[PDB]
Amino acid sequence: SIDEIYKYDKKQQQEILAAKPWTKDHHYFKYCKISALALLKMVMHARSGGNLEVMGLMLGKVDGETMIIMDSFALPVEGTETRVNAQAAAYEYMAAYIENAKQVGRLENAIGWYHSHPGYGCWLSGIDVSTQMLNQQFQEPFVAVVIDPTRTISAGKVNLGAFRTYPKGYKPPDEGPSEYQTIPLNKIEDFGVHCKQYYALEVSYFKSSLDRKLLELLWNKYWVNTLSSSSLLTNADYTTGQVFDLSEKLEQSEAQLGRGSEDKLAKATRDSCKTTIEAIHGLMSQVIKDKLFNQINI
Amino acid sequence: TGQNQEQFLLLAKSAKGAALATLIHQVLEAPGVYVFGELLDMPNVRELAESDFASTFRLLTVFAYGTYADYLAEARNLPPLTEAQKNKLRHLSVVTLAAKVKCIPYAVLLEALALRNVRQLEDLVIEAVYADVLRGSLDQRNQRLEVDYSIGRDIQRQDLSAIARTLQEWCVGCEVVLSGIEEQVSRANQHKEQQLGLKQQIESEVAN
Amino acid sequence: QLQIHYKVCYARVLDYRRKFIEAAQRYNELSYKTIVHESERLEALKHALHCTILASAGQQRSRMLATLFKDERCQQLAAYGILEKMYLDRIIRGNQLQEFAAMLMPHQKATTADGSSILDRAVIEHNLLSASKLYNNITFEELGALLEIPAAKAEKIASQMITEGRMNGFIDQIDGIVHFETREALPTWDKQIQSLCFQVNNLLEKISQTAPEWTAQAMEAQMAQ
Amino acid sequence: SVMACGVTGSVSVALHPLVILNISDHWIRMRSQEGRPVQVIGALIGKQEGRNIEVMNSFELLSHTVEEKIIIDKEYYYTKEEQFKQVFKELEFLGWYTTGGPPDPSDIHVHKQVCEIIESPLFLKLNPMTKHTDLPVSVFESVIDIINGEATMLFAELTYTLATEEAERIGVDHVARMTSTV
Ligand SMILES: [Zn+2]
């Protein structure tokens, strides 16, 4: 049953919140299921912030080791990424929003917070870790979602991560693959300092039976938009910003070879590869358009 | 056109020789009516061909297939037209030019529409865009008309095949692009796996 | 009836006070009153339309132009031409303005400085902006000729509108040409591709609507391949 | 079939697919709660650039039924407006949506209530029980006409296009797909 997940069982949620199985295991929550609606709304909000960080709250529920995000909404706050618990400034607004949402049949409560990292990847900074640690101390069960709208566009793939922090003093176990992301030099220090203080959840998405139907019928006309994307100039300034960074990274990797951190050149090579590969994919779409609409004649 | 099609077809099925001959002068001197395909294919108007009102049928043939220069070449035979009808036929000639090429120089337009100064031509192109016949923009400095969209006028039962001749030329085009991707994607895997395999050989020599 | 006679008088007072958008709204509301005779409802609508045309350019005026353009009864008015043309951003000719100006009361022909009326200047500015949608660039001589004003005035007003941020463009004084915001290059190519594929979708929908039999018959052939 | 059925109006509506998903989710959630299909109602927000309207987001509206007529809670709307203006400062109320077949007298009654809030609101209707192969979304404007001396409101349908936002396209595509760099 595709729509079974949309059923809200209040007593079952109260029972889970009274049981608190997450207190028995700091790796209890392993999966993050996000509705297509919440994904779209968070990505749309994230893009609307442009190069500035925005944030919001996520409404949802828990089911075993899985955290479920049903909806989201933006918070009118300043200092996302600079202020610890910046969300706190919107407390009043959050209370009213939810109250008004309950009046129209939104039954799910706060399950987490989302914020954007435009052009610098999905991870938790020091400020983010303090914020999420506060949230897990006083508002548990809570999850932190991070989205990079800029990299979503440049890579043609959704750039989203879901994270949970470890309590102060607690050490993670042996296994940590850590899927690699290019982090700019102005953020890499803080990234490295806090990268072992949290873990990443396995993210998956879902939609309803009606969403399924409507998206197939939308596609019957929305295909036109895929052959008219123009991705190379929409967010050009990003690739030029990344090249700048890449240049300074290469300066540091040259300084490493000078006389005498673990092989900076290989990292820089993977960064230059990623940026170039994205650029060539852009050109691939442009050439495809040229082959389909220009090389036809009378 | 759309409303005028039904509105004048209703009158076309209930009209005779002279009334149809004057109705031709009424449909050509009416704003919005730039296609005469349904009206020219009527048996009632077919009777007028090779009859007492033959020049009017020839005039309808010029308005549905020919250009303003074709009218000027046969103006002695064709019935006289007012400024509104001459304009309309000029609009349709610009549509034929726009059907040929996207960027039309002013010289070709001035010669084809038989105009003397630039503003007359510019005002006619404005009248075209305002009557939803053409879409585009005018470039003064390079003396060129940039056409964004032009409507369909000629029906052409015999030359219909040409449309398909281009449609197939597009289809084949797609069929190349599609296959191209299918191949390139395959290659992108063909490399990857190979490289992985090669790496797994290098990594097997670490034990020795 | 007496209450309606006041409402009419109140609208007329606003009209005479040059509170044209407010007058237009009051006149427009009067035109909806079924207790008023049809002929007088249309007189009210005509007054609303004239006041809206004469009103100061902006959001309230543009919203009223939209309201009036959606009202089918406006097609019974001599000024419908003018309404339609500005609502649709068309160039208004001197001749068409001559007739409209003759439709107005003396008080409605108010003049700001050297004899020039608010309407005269509004129409020039409307026409400049409308011309900016037809051309990528144009000479002042030609622009003046199209707008029925001297070339120096076309340059001066274009220059003012550009400086004031009401039109996007730039002026070349040596070559005597104004350049309008082109928005061409690759984004135009993408938009033309959209137009072509939208034309494709409209054509398929019309094939399925007019003849669904062959549409299904040829639809099965795609699955057969 | 009481509606306008004549001349076109603004004819420039760009719809974002987020709005379609909002309305689908609203209908699915109310249907899940009641165990039967429920007519849902809400607000459409976005931008208006001249005659171009861009429908970018939406939110659920509160209503009650007095006898058999649907009444929109206006206090709720103004409260919600005070709340969305804090995070979508550049966006404006453009109209309303509901679910069902072709427009009916109830839609006109509600549309008049929305007309008390904004001057020329759009009306969007989504049919979640469609039998047909085309996207079951329609958009309408209201026209005020005189038929046999009675000044009455009617709907005129507008054509619409889908939005061209790159991030939204990728998101929608990713959702629709739901599974080497090249
Ligand atoms: Zn952050």
UniProtKB/Swiss-Prot annotation, chain A:
Probable protease subunit of the COP9 signalosome complex (CSN), a complex involved in various cellular and developmental processes. The CSN complex is an essential regulator of the ubiquitin (Ubl) conjugation pathway by mediating the deneddylation of the cullin subunits of the SCF-type E3 ligase complexes, leading to decrease the Ubl ligase activity of SCF-type complexes such as SCF, CSA or DDB2. The complex is also involved in phosphorylation of p53/TP53, c-jun/JUN, IkappaBalpha/NFKBIA, ITPK1 and IRF8, possibly via its association with CK2 and PKD kinases. Keywords: Acetylation, Cytoplasm, Cytoplasmic vesicle, Hydrolase, Metal-binding, Metalloprotease, Nucleus, Protease, Signalosome, Synapse, Zinc. It comes from Homo sapiens. Transmembrane segments: none annotated. This is COP9 signalosome complex subunit 5. The JAMM motif is essential for the protease activity of the CSN complex resulting in deneddylation of cullins. It constitutes the catalytic center of the complex. GO terms for cellular component: chromatin; COP9 signalosome; cytoplasm; cytosol; eukaryotic translation initiation factor 3 complex; nucleoplasm; nucleus; perinuclear region of cytoplasm. CDD domains: MPN_RPN11_CSN5.
Swiss-Prot record, chain B:
Residues 178-208 form a coiled coil. It is found in: Cytoplasm; Nucleus. GO terms for cellular component: COP9 signalosome; cytoplasm; cytosol; nucleoplasm; nucleus. Keywords: Acetylation, Coiled coil, Cytoplasm, Host-virus interaction, Nucleus, Phosphoprotein, Signalosome. Its main location: cytoplasm. Phosphorylated by CK2 and PKD kinases. Component of the CSN complex, composed of COPS1/GPS1, COPS2, COPS3, COPS4, COPS5, COPS6, COPS7 (COPS7A or COPS7B), COPS8 and COPS9 isoform 1. In the complex, it probably interacts directly with COPS1, COPS2, COPS4, COPS5, COPS6 and COPS8. Interacts with PMF1. Interacts with the translation initiation factor EIF3S6. Interacts with CK2 and PKD. Interacts directly with ID3. (Microbial infection) Interacts with vaccinia virus protein C9L. Belongs to the CSN7/EIF3M family. CSN7 subfamily. This is COP9 signalosome complex subunit 7a. It comes from Homo sapiens (Human).
Swiss-Prot record, chain C:
GO terms for cellular component: cell junction; COP9 signalosome; cytoplasm; cytosol; nuclear speck; nucleoplasm; nucleus; synaptic vesicle. Its main location: cytoplasm. It comes from the Eukaryota. Keywords: Acetylation, Cytoplasm, Cytoplasmic vesicle, Nucleus, Signalosome, Synapse. One of its GO terms (biological process) is protein deneddylation. One of its GO terms (molecular function) is deNEDDylase activity. The keyword Acetylation applies. It is found in: Cytoplasm; Nucleus; Cytoplasmic vesicle, Secretory vesicle, Synaptic vesicle. Residues 16-185 form the PCI domain. Component of the COP9 signalosome complex (CSN), a complex involved in various cellular and developmental processes. The CSN complex is an essential regulator of the ubiquitin (Ubl) conjugation pathway by mediating the deneddylation of the cullin subunits of SCF-type E3 ligase complexes, leading to decrease the Ubl ligase activity of SCF-type complexes such as SCF, CSA or DDB2. Also involved in the deneddylation of non-cullin subunits such as STON2. Belongs to the CSN4 family. Component of the CSN complex, composed of COPS1/GPS1, COPS2, COPS3, COPS4, COPS5, COPS6, COPS7 (COPS7A or COPS7B), COPS8 and COPS9 isoform 1. In the complex, it probably interacts directly with COPS1, COPS2, COPS3, COPS5, COPS6, COPS7 (COPS7A or COPS7B) and COPS8. Interacts with TOR1A; the interaction is direct and associates TOR1A and SNAPIN with the CSN complex. Interacts with STON2; controls STON2 neddylation levels. Interacts with ERCC6.
From Swiss-Prot, chain D:
This is COP9 signalosome complex subunit 6. It is found in: Nucleus; Cytoplasm; Cytoplasm, Perinuclear region. Residues 13-146 form the MPN domain. The chain holds residues 29 to 217 of 327 of the full protein. Belongs to the peptidase M67A family. CSN6 subfamily. GO terms for cellular component: COP9 signalosome; cytoplasm; cytosol; nucleoplasm; nucleus; perinuclear region of cytoplasm. It comes from the Eukaryota. Component of the COP9 signalosome complex (CSN), a complex involved in various cellular and developmental processes. The CSN complex is an essential regulator of the ubiquitin (Ubl) conjugation pathway by mediating the deneddylation of the cullin subunits of SCF-type E3 ligase complexes, leading to decrease the Ubl ligase activity of SCF-type complexes such as SCF, CSA or DDB2. The complex is also involved in phosphorylation of p53/TP53, c-jun/JUN, IkappaBalpha/NFKBIA, ITPK1 and IRF8, possibly via its association with CK2 and PKD kinases. The keyword Lipid biosynthesis does not apply. The lineage of its organism: Eukaryota, Metazoa, Chordata, Craniata, Vertebrata.
